[PDB]
Design a protein around this ligand. Sequence first.
Ligand SMILES: COc1ccc(/C(C)=N/OCC(=O)N2C[C@H](C)O[C@@H](C)C2)cc1OC1CCCC1
Ligand SMILES: COc1ccc(/C(C)=N\OCC(=O)N2C[C@H](C)O[C@@H](C)C2)cc1OC1CCCC1
Ligand SMILES: [Mg+2]
Ligand SMILES: [Mg+2]
Ligand SMILES: [Mg+2]
Ligand SMILES: [Mg+2]
Ligand SMILES: [Mg+2]
Ligand SMILES: [Mg+2]
Ligand SMILES: [Mg+2]
Ligand SMILES: [Mg+2]
Ligand SMILES: [Zn+2]
Ligand SMILES: [Zn+2]
Lengths: 327, 332
Amino acid sequence: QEDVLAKELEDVNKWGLHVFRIAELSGNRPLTVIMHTIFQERDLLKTFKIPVDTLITYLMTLEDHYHADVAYHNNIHAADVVQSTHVLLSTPALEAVFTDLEILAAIFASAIHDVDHPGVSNQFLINTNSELALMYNDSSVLENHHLAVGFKLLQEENCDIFQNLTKKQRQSLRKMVIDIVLATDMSKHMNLLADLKTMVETKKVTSSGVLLLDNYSDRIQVLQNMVHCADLSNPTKPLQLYRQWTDRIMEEFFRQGDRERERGMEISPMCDKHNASVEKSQVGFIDYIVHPLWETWADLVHPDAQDILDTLEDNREWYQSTIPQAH
Amino acid sequence: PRFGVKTEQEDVLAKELEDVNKWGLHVFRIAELSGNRPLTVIMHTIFQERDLLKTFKIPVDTLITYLMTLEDHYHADVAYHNNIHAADVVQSTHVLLSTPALEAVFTDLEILAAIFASAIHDVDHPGVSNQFLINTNSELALMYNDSSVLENHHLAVGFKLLQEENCDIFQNLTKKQRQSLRKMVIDIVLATDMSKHMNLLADLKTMVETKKVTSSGVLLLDNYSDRIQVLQNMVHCADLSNPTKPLQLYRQWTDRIMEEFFRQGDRERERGMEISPMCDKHNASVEKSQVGFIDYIVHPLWETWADLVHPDAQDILDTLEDNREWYQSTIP
Ligand SMILES: COc1ccc(/C(C)=N/OCC(=O)N2C[C@H](C)O[C@@H](C)C2)cc1OC1CCCC1
Ligand SMILES: COc1ccc(/C(C)=N\OCC(=O)N2C[C@H](C)O[C@@H](C)C2)cc1OC1CCCC1
Ligand SMILES: [Mg+2]
Ligand SMILES: [Mg+2]
Ligand SMILES: [Mg+2]
Ligand SMILES: [Mg+2]
Ligand SMILES: [Mg+2]
Ligand SMILES: [Mg+2]
Ligand SMILES: [Mg+2]
Ligand SMILES: [Mg+2]
Ligand SMILES: [Zn+2]
Ligand SMILES: [Zn+2]
């Protein structure tokens, strides 16, 4: 029913959009539907002379290159990161900070950032001597590959959505998108966080409270962290959505662990279906990765992200409540 | 065969290979005397010299098969970035590793990594720059996201050739030796990207400022970071060693890099592109450009290396200064 779909797409500017319902209602086309809605919402097709049929053709072939049998790293995850980035771009602390081209880069980066993901980690690909790790010299193996596939698809018939950008704009967009997707590699998380903390310490704001970002380095660092936050946003969502993401990532991990077991390898942490606690694993994920990042983003845009941080803290307290603890 | 390939006389080739431990080995003669197999000949000689086949249980037929295949993937129609340049960088790294200030500093696996990295470090080079590949939307630049495009490719090819029939020279390394060597080779070849030269040199100057030495001048390296940084700079110096060589060698290397640069500029001109600096055969100042190259890149690098291994490199530096004066004296 196209009636219900348009009703759910009314929430596209809100944290917590019911992306799984959109996936079902759209015929498993959440990335196409949500990207189109956002491009309409931000008037991107007219600012960048994007033919609507070119946009739809690219989005459908991009969505086609996310794998349906990969439980977490599929087109629903892409659509979720896109929509979350779309919300974060509109945070009041960043009002009129970014150019339309920077906004287009951040949303495009989000849409392609996990394309053709195989469902196994960079470390797995390195340790199994995979062809992808051979091509990429063991360095941000997946993220380099996502970028290459995402740009390569712009070459399919009637898929060049950037055809009416100037050369300067195309060159700037490509650079920003590369910079953003490479920052989604989790091995870069601690260095990204260390620098974001220092940027918070020295941040400049207009009197109206809007952040001041003078040069490319400061601008791209904010977009990098903002898409990294959107990628790591599942525990900040309403519990009904967060539970579904947790099911999917645990399915994907356990599939990788089963391949490791078959192969005689050490099963990676959290990948052993027989000896894992989901509750501990999420509480550790929030405590050591997700909350340190979001409390720093929240500092940067204070108080814009307080409701997001409140949900994250409530979900942490919820997941820890059934783990026995010394009181 | 005596030297790894068949040659129309091993006696002339042997007297030339007696210089494999000397700066200024006549690498172009070796290429001729070996039937254009200088990389195979010189690598075989070094592996025997250093006893690396026995240390790592490398069958000699596997070594020769890999070197043949690797050599075949350097392009014969590229004037500079060909199998002779690879052979030169290997042999120069081999001399630098023997410098007195580095006596017993590196393990056999670190030596193997430096020499292997030198051999593969430009394989399948197409004769155009990273920036040309980016500017022309090449598939390689698409694959590698405009970052160290060629150097990522040379690594990928050099490692992939290990998988061909009877080519796996590392088959008898342990799995963690393989892992360590792989990481060091990647770290070394990525450092040959010239866009990293200024950062690499700045860090080398910092290492020189706080260098630790025994009483006899031998460097004291403390950890992987120290060791890999010295190997990275060593192979970068070997890559940038042409102007420090005997002048007749340097003159040929200059002729070859200009031929390659000019053919890239012709491709740029044909496509209406701005011609890259030093690639316009119609507006070139070859001699002035060599003096600039030495003043701004090569001398600052080699004076810092010479500081690290003082006084081991003093003659290399003196030759650099004399060669600078040759090109200065021939500016029209
Ligand atoms: C909903 O929860 C999660 C959502 C997303 C993620 C991602 C993308 N995490 O990135 C880490 C990573 O890629 N690994 C890759 C390899 C499998 O080895 C592992 C040790 C880590 C992680 C979530 O939860 C965690 C903690 C318990 C379940 C997973
Ligand atoms: C014997 O002389 C040379 C030997 C080697 C080189 C190499 C491999 N690289 O140099 C940097 C580079 O890769 N570039 C590539 C692109 C064309 O754009 C430029 C930024 C330079 C350069 C030599 O001399 C050159 C530099 C001065 C006169 C010609
Ligand atoms: Mg990813
Ligand atoms: Mg459940
Ligand atoms: Mg905390
Ligand atoms: Mg020994
Ligand atoms: Mg090179
Ligand atoms: Mg064996
Ligand atoms: Mg030290
Ligand atoms: Mg003129
Ligand atoms: Zn992701
Ligand atoms: Zn080279």
